[PDB]
């Protein structure tokens, strides 16, 4: 059971998959989308090639 | 970094760099797709020492 | 074995695993010293009596 759930959706190319990880920072990620070190939850990429 | 020919694996070319100022911001920015994963040190601007 | 060198060379999420083992070693040293001091104090108290 959880207090609340937040869902975030955006398109990211497969070359950019490695940089979008919890705690693994990247320049393009650091200026667009940063994840906290203690992030709890799941990150899923859905096939849209 | 920007050269013409690179040596083979079995005979690898070693270069010595000393007595200058090494700005590590250009390497990180240009050709960002190039892998830049570091051991022992953090490339996240903590390379200025 | 220098705290500042660890802090001035690594980003936090990988510096933590180094700080932790330094902390464990130093805590062990302090605990051993305190135990020996307690035993020595007991002997000195017997002599004073």
Short mmCIF file of C-alpha atoms in Angstrom, two decimals:
data_model
loop_
_atom_site.label_atom_id
_atom_site.label_comp_id
_atom_site.label_asym_id
_atom_site.label_seq_id
_atom_site.Cartn_x
_atom_site.Cartn_y
_atom_site.Cartn_z
CA UNK A 1 0.00 0.00 0.00
CA UNK A 2 1.26 3.46 -0.93
CA UNK A 3 0.40 7.03 -0.01
CA UNK A 4 0.50 8.32 -3.60
CA UNK A 5 1.91 7.48 -7.03
CA UNK A 6 3.47 9.92 -9.50
CA UNK A 7 3.79 9.03 -13.18
CA UNK A 8 6.04 10.97 -15.57
CA UNK A 9 5.99 10.41 -19.33
CA UNK A 10 8.31 11.66 -22.06
CA UNK A 11 10.09 10.32 -25.14
CA UNK A 12 13.77 9.38 -24.89
CA UNK A 13 15.84 7.69 -27.58
CA UNK A 14 17.49 4.33 -26.95
CA UNK A 15 20.93 5.94 -27.13
CA UNK A 16 19.83 7.99 -24.10
CA UNK A 17 18.66 5.00 -22.02
CA UNK A 18 21.87 4.64 -20.01
CA UNK A 19 21.92 8.25 -18.80
CA UNK A 20 18.34 8.10 -17.49
CA UNK A 21 18.99 5.97 -14.41
CA UNK A 22 18.50 6.52 -10.67
CA UNK A 23 21.64 8.27 -9.42
CA UNK A 24 23.49 7.96 -12.74
CA UNK A 25 23.75 11.59 -13.79
CA UNK A 26 24.41 12.90 -17.28
CA UNK A 27 24.88 16.34 -18.78
CA UNK A 28 21.80 16.18 -21.01
CA UNK A 29 19.94 14.57 -18.10
CA UNK A 30 21.35 17.07 -15.59
CA UNK A 31 19.91 19.95 -17.61
CA UNK A 32 16.60 18.20 -18.37
CA UNK A 33 15.69 15.42 -15.89
CA UNK A 34 17.52 14.62 -12.65
CA UNK A 35 16.65 11.71 -10.36
CA UNK A 36 17.23 11.84 -6.59
CA UNK A 37 19.81 9.54 -5.06
CA UNK A 38 17.26 7.97 -2.70
CA UNK A 39 14.58 7.59 -5.38
CA UNK A 40 12.02 4.84 -4.74
CA UNK A 41 9.89 3.50 -7.57
CA UNK A 42 10.34 1.99 -11.01
CA UNK A 43 11.53 3.26 -14.39
CA UNK A 44 10.10 1.54 -17.47
CA UNK A 45 10.85 2.10 -21.15
CA UNK A 46 8.12 1.07 -23.60
CA UNK A 47 8.91 -0.02 -27.15
CA UNK A 48 8.12 2.76 -29.64
CA UNK A 49 10.86 2.34 -32.24
CA UNK B 1 42.19 13.37 -29.36
CA UNK B 2 42.04 14.72 -32.93
CA UNK B 3 44.62 12.86 -35.00
CA UNK B 4 44.89 10.85 -38.22
CA UNK B 5 46.13 7.32 -37.46
CA UNK B 6 45.89 5.30 -34.24
CA UNK B 7 48.29 2.49 -33.39
CA UNK B 8 47.28 -1.15 -33.10
CA UNK B 9 46.33 -2.95 -29.90
CA UNK B 10 49.47 -5.08 -29.59
CA UNK B 11 51.64 -1.97 -30.11
CA UNK B 12 49.79 0.86 -28.38
CA UNK B 13 51.03 4.45 -28.48
CA UNK B 14 51.74 6.12 -25.13
CA UNK B 15 51.82 9.92 -24.84
CA UNK B 16 53.20 11.98 -21.96
CA UNK B 17 51.50 15.24 -20.97
CA UNK B 18 53.01 17.57 -18.38
CA UNK B 19 53.61 21.23 -17.50
CA UNK B 20 50.43 22.78 -18.89
CA UNK B 21 46.82 23.62 -18.02
CA UNK B 22 44.34 20.80 -18.68
CA UNK B 23 40.77 22.00 -19.18
CA UNK B 24 38.58 18.90 -18.90
CA UNK B 25 35.35 20.70 -19.82
CA UNK B 26 35.97 20.52 -23.58
CA UNK B 27 36.38 16.73 -23.61
CA UNK B 28 33.17 16.20 -21.65
CA UNK B 29 31.13 18.59 -23.81
CA UNK B 30 32.32 17.77 -27.33
CA UNK B 31 31.33 14.33 -28.65
CA UNK B 32 29.22 13.65 -25.57
CA UNK B 33 28.17 10.27 -26.99
CA UNK B 34 31.76 9.06 -26.46
CA UNK B 35 31.89 6.97 -23.30
CA UNK B 36 33.38 8.95 -20.42
CA UNK B 37 33.00 6.60 -17.45
CA UNK B 38 35.82 7.17 -14.97
CA UNK B 39 37.49 5.12 -12.23
CA UNK B 40 38.78 6.52 -8.95
CA UNK B 41 37.81 10.10 -9.82
CA UNK B 42 34.54 11.82 -10.68
CA UNK B 43 34.32 13.48 -14.12
CA UNK B 44 31.40 15.62 -12.90
CA UNK B 45 33.59 18.76 -12.85
CA UNK B 46 35.49 17.26 -9.89
CA UNK B 47 38.40 16.81 -12.33
CA UNK B 48 39.77 20.34 -11.73
CA UNK B 49 42.70 19.59 -9.45
CA UNK C 1 43.06 7.67 4.82
CA UNK C 2 42.45 11.43 4.42
CA UNK C 3 38.85 12.60 4.61
CA UNK C 4 39.31 15.71 2.47
CA UNK C 5 41.03 13.77 -0.31
CA UNK C 6 38.03 11.42 -0.49
CA UNK C 7 35.57 14.32 -0.45
CA UNK C 8 37.52 16.44 -2.95
CA UNK C 9 37.81 13.58 -5.47
CA UNK C 10 34.52 11.60 -5.53
CA UNK C 11 30.86 12.45 -5.89
CA UNK C 12 28.66 11.57 -2.87
CA UNK C 13 27.02 8.25 -3.84
CA UNK C 14 30.42 6.59 -4.35
CA UNK C 15 32.15 8.52 -1.55
CA UNK C 16 29.70 7.02 0.95
CA UNK C 17 31.04 3.47 0.64
CA UNK C 18 34.53 4.76 1.48
CA UNK C 19 33.46 7.00 4.34
CA UNK C 20 31.57 4.08 5.87
CA UNK C 21 34.59 1.78 6.12
CA UNK C 22 36.76 4.59 7.47
CA UNK C 23 34.08 5.19 10.12
CA UNK C 24 33.89 1.51 11.05
CA UNK C 25 37.65 1.25 11.52
CA UNK C 26 37.87 4.38 13.64
CA UNK C 27 34.91 3.28 15.78
CA UNK C 28 36.59 -0.07 16.41
CA UNK C 29 39.79 1.68 17.49
CA UNK C 30 37.91 3.95 19.90
CA UNK C 31 35.98 1.03 21.40
CA UNK C 32 39.16 -0.97 22.01
CA UNK C 33 40.85 2.00 23.67
CA UNK C 34 37.87 2.62 25.96
CA UNK C 35 37.70 -1.03 27.06
CA UNK C 36 41.40 -1.11 27.93
CA UNK C 37 41.03 2.15 29.87
CA UNK C 38 38.14 0.70 31.87
CA UNK C 39 40.15 -2.37 32.89
CA UNK C 40 43.17 -0.24 33.80
CA UNK C 41 40.97 2.07 35.89
CA UNK C 42 39.61 -0.92 37.81
CA UNK C 43 43.13 -2.08 38.66
CA UNK C 44 44.17 1.44 39.72
CA UNK C 45 41.09 1.68 41.95
CA UNK C 46 42.04 -1.56 43.68
CA UNK C 47 45.55 -0.20 44.29
CA UNK C 48 44.14 3.06 45.67
CA UNK C 49 41.87 1.17 48.06
#
